Ligand binder design. Structure first.
Ligand SMILES: O=C(O)CNC(=O)C(=O)O
Ligand SMILES: [Mg+2]
Ligand code: NI
Ligand SMILES: [Zn+2]
Length: 331
């Protein structure tokens, strides 16, 4: 079996190998990359996402989210308080302010230490889940706005024809902005490209061990667990690497830098934080190997997780028994 220790793999495709997205994902899995739950792909040196970022300040963050934490440094929840709209120019200036900027630090490890020590005492502002793309339309390779759609994958594999669309989202981060422990909707893959700015640190649990993380989370967030059978779908719970190590949860960590892609694999729990002002673009995708994960994916039926138009159809076709009780939560 390839990659039996479930290490995060880093790939360096050639420009020739960067032409066929599906085929390269299949290659990475042939080498065991999915066992980690997360892979890093460094694009060929010849490739560019776009010519420059020189006009990005005019993008609007309609609903910036202030991420307020509750709990202890290693085990906390975050709630998202909606703030007034601001441009990316305004946001970048805010990120660079004395109140919000990255603190002095020696290296990524010292900054990771400062994050876990001090995250809970601050409320950074995240511009998340903004529909859009920063890939140039003339970028033909690994353009996250030109991927094959999940609906088309389901049609190719299963013959069924469903409504829904699949588009990318932009994320504007600052120091301490946080993504809580989660898998993707319907345990899809994701791909994330860090367009510009400061790094993003990721933590991931191998898919084969995801249930271990879930069991820990029910012990650590016991009232949340009683309220919903899939509360990690709410995307509010954080657990530090120290706490994971204390409880024997297998995980890995890696830092993504500007210009790099990350791929999360089906049922690969992940969480992380931003080091400073940055902009990432991400989208869900499917392969044939996903279909079984989609059939088995948990769902939030408490009604908090409140999910997309397109996820309806996935549930309806792959999980017809759930369909009924799941859409009572989403209506
Ligand atoms: O970049 C972020 O804040 C969160 N990204 C993801 O969880 C992802 O790409 O799957
Ligand atoms: Mg602009
Ligand atoms: Ni994700
Ligand atoms: Zn729920």
């Amino acid at each position: 079996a390839q990659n039996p220790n479930c290490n995060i793999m880093i790939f360096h495709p050639t420009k020739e190998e960067f032409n066929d997205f599906d085929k390269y994902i299949a290659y990475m899995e042939s080498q065991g990359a999915h066992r980690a739950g997360l892979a890093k792909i460094i694009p060929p040196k010849e490739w560019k996402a776009r010519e420059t970022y020189d006009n990005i300040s005019e993008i609007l963050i309609a609903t910036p989210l202030q991420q307020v934490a509750s709990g202890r440094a290693g085990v906390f929840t975050q709630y998202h308080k909606k703030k007034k709209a601001m441009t990316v120019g305004e946001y970048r200036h805010l990120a660079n302010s004395k109140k919000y900027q990255t603190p002095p630090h020696q290296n990524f490890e010292d900054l990771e230490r400062k994050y876990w020590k001090n995250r809970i005492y601050n409320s950074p502002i995240y511009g998340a889940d903004i529909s859009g793309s920063l890939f140039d339309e003339n970028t033909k390779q690994w353009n996250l706005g030109h991927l094959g759609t999940i609906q088309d994958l389901l049609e190719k594999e299963c013959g069924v024809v469903i409504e829904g669309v699949n588009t990318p989202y932009l994320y504007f981060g600052m120091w301490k902005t946080t993504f809580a422990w989660h898998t993707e909707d319907m345990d899809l893959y994701s791909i994330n490209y860090l367009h510009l700015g400061e790094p993003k640190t990721w933590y991931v649990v191998p898919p084969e061990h995801g249930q271990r993380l879930e069991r820990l989370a029910r012990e650590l967030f016991p009232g949340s667990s009683r309220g919903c059978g899939a509360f990690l779908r709410h995307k509010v719970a954080l657990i530090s690497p120290t706490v994971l190590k204390e409880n024997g949860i297998p995980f890995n960590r890696i830092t993504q830098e500007a210009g790099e892609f990350m791929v999360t694999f089906p049922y690969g729990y992940h969480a992380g934080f931003n080091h400073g002002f940055n902009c990432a673009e991400a989208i869900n995708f499917a392969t044939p190997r996903w279909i079984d994960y989609g059939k088995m994916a948990s769902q939030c039926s408490c009604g908090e997780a409140r999910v997309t138009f397109s996820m309806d159809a996935f549930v309806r076709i792959l999980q017809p028994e759930r369909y009924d009780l799941w859409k009572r939560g989403q209506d």
